[PDB]
Amino acid sequence: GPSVFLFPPKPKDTLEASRTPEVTCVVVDVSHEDPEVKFNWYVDGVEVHNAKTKPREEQYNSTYRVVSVLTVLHQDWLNGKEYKCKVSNKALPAPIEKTISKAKGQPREPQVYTLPPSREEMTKNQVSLVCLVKGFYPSDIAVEWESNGQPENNYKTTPPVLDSDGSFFLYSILTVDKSRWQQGNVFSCSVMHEALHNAYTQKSLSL
Amino acid sequence: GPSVFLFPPKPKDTLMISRTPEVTCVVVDVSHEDPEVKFNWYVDGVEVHNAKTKPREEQYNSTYRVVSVLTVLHQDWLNGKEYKCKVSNKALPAPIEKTISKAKGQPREPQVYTLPPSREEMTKNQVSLTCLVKGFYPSDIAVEWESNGQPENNYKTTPPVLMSDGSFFLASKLTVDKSRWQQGNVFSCSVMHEALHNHYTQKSLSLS
Amino acid sequence: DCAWHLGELVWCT
Ligand SMILES: *[C@@H]1O[C@H](CO[C@@H]2O[C@@H](C)[C@@H](O)[C@@H](O)[C@@H]2O)[C@@H](O[C@@H]2O[C@H](CO)[C@@H](O[C@@H]3O[C@H](CO[C@H]4O[C@H](CO)[C@@H](O)[C@H](O)[C@@H]4O[C@@H]4O[C@H](CO)[C@@H](O[C@@H]5O[C@H](CO)[C@H](O)[C@H](O)[C@H]5O)[C@H](O)[C@H]4NC(C)=O)[C@@H](O)[C@H](O[C@H]4O[C@H](CO)[C@@H](O)[C@H](O)[C@@H]4O)[C@@H]3O)[C@H](O)[C@H]2NC(C)=O)[C@H](O)[C@H]1NC(C)=O
Ligand SMILES: *[C@@H]1O[C@H](CO[C@@H]2O[C@@H](C)[C@@H](O)[C@@H](O)[C@@H]2O)[C@@H](O[C@@H]2O[C@H](CO)[C@@H](O[C@@H]3O[C@H](CO[C@H]4O[C@H](CO)[C@@H](O)[C@H](O)[C@@H]4O[C@@H]4O[C@H](CO)[C@@H](O[C@@H]5O[C@H](CO)[C@H](O)[C@H](O)[C@H]5O)[C@H](O)[C@H]4NC(C)=O)[C@@H](O)[C@H](O[C@H]4O[C@H](CO)[C@@H](O)[C@H](O)[C@@H]4O)[C@@H]3O)[C@H](O)[C@H]2NC(C)=O)[C@H](O)[C@H]1NC(C)=O
Fold it and tell me: For residue B91, which of B194, B29, B1, B183 has the smallest C-alpha distance?
């Protein structure tokens, strides 16, 4: 029979009032002979009826993919409400229930430190600008870069690593032409996390 | 039916001449009825004979785990030879073959830079010493920290991240009491990777 | 030359 996967909203979506975060229940391996999927949703065991179903999609391996998407309120999610998708299909003995929620436990404010390039790196064409983000709980976060109000896109960020004090940390790295750094330009690290003031901070770095 | 899993040597073992790299062909779900397993090994399609079977292990779920181990040479591995384990057994319509090797691709040397804590970290009880390792290929590596000959075990290291030029970066963060940092103590970043000179480099870090 | 790690030999050219 069918398999179910329930997915969280994007970190950035829960953290920005303008954006609409959602919980996505996906059903794969849905047979051609029985396409009909029945979705029930509950928020803390209380059924809700505002879910919206995505257009059915042919996969070409004999099966359908069926997607139900539940809009959520920021506070409902951040306050830790539990979301349950229940999926009924005629190829199942019994409905499949799946649940998810924000990670549990004391949220912790992240510490954002920007680290300049090393003297040894200064011989190179390009330099590395580092933003160590540490002391945060839970692991749900987003990181970005910029210079004079414009987005700087040549960076990579590690996944959150679990630290020995039970919080998470990551590094993110922006690589720039050494000329730009020598020339005094300001470069900025943007962090969105639930336990920040206004769920946003920005730390800047310049030679 | 019985299933096969084949696992590489530890990078450290392939990288330290004083260690012994080995590849490991694990076979799970071996029935009580037909327990007998036959390993053939090939290295770049050429059969080799010096593999050795580890002691049979009975599991909780009524089946055997049978494991064969091939010693390999540091440079064959690092030169990228392909190692094939072929497993036969009565409960099996057909022998299961599995192959592994080092990731293919020209090796590139990591750039290893050590980085003091942020000025802003200086209020806190503990500070972060950062070891940035950038532009290595392939992702096989070992990073460790020390001071005055002794290992410092209070670090964490990111997994390798793939970059837009095709090499990898990671960072390692060692956490010390601020007073240890303030006290002049020298700390060191050990990086072991195939494309470094002698497979090893070390970078130091102290209060300036 | 040779490199050593915690007094264990790594490699020599
Ligand atoms: C027929 O094919 C289908 C489809 O496969 C595609 O087509 C085939 C023919 C091939 O070409 C494939 O290569 C194609 O993918 C097969 O369906 C697959 O079944 C797999 C298992 O049955 C299933 O594996 C599970 O994957 C989970 C991860 O899924 C993620 O990530 C993968 C990519 O890595 C991606 O394929 C999925 O779509 C999904 O991606 C996320 O989607 C969600 C929801 O849409 C996104 O979040 C929402 O979206 C927006 C953002 O745009 C918004 O922000 C919302 O707010 C937000 O909620 C999210 O962003 C996406 N993430 C990413 C990274 O892309 C694993 O988690 C899972 O593992 C778990 O279970 C295992 C066992 O329990 C454990 O090992 C494991 O540890 C975990 O517990 C599974 O591995 C594949 O996902 C699935 N593929 C698709 C596309 O659905 C089908 O199998 C096949 N049928 C047959 C008979 O062969
Ligand atoms: C009956 O039970 C057995 C065993 O069950 C165990 O006991 C109880 C308590 C259970 O709760 C289990 O959880 C226990 O494992 C079942 O056997 C299991 O079956 C699984 C599949 O059938 C198999 O999954 C595969 O796992 C791979 C990773 O395995 C690692 O890591 C796990 C833990 O994460 C560990 O248990 C394994 O033994 C194995 O560990 C590695 O062993 C190698 C080889 O020895 C080590 O490498 C060597 O190390 C030495 C040092 O001594 C030296 O360095 C050598 O040079 C070097 O070669 C290596 O270091 C070990 N690593 C770790 C972390 O320990 C997955 O990669 C693999 O996934 C792949 O395939 C999947 C599809 O099959 C894909 O989804 C996926 O994408 C991948 O491609 C598998 O998931 C379990 O490993 C296996 N467990 C054991 C112990 O063998 C059995 O299935 C069950 N029977 C029935 C009928 O249900």
Answer: B1
As given in the structure block, the two tokens for residue A98 are 């799946």
Query: Which 8-state DSSP code applies to residue A55?
Result: P
Question: What is the C-alpha to C-alpha distance for residues B131 and B203, in angstroms, rounded to an integer?
Answer: 8
- Is-contact A125 A177, C-beta < 8 A? yes
Q: Ligand 1, closest atom to CA A8?
A: 58
Residue spans in chain A of domains classed CATH 2.60.40.10: 2-101, 102-207
The residue whose CB lies within 8 Å of the most ligand 1 atoms, and thus the one to mutate among A3, A4, A5, is A5
Distance CA B58, CA B28 (A): 10
> What residues in C contact B194, CB-CB < 8 Å?
none
Nearest CA to ligand 1 atom 40: A7
Residue reference for tokens 């601020």: B178
Q: CATH classification of B2-101 is 2.30.29.30, yes or no?
A: no
Quote the distance between the C-alpha of residue B180 and its chain's center.
Answer: 31
Residue B79 DSSP SS3 = helix
Q: Which H or E element spans position B22? A: strand B22-30
Q: DSSP states of C1-13 as a string?
A: -EEEETTEEEEE-
Is the beta carbon of A144 within 6 A of some atom in ligand 1?
Answer: no
Structure tokens at A46: 């209380």
Spatial CA neighbour of A62 closest among A30, A26, A92: A30
Question: What superfamily does domain A102-207 belong to in CATH?
Answer: Immunoglobulins (2.60.40.10)
Nearest to A26, CA basis, from A96, A93, A102: A96
Neighbours of A127 (CB within 10 A): 22
- Cα A191–A186–A175 angle (5° rounding)? 75
> Alpha-carbon distance B83 to B71, whole Å?
11
**A101, A80 contact by CB (below 8 A):** yes
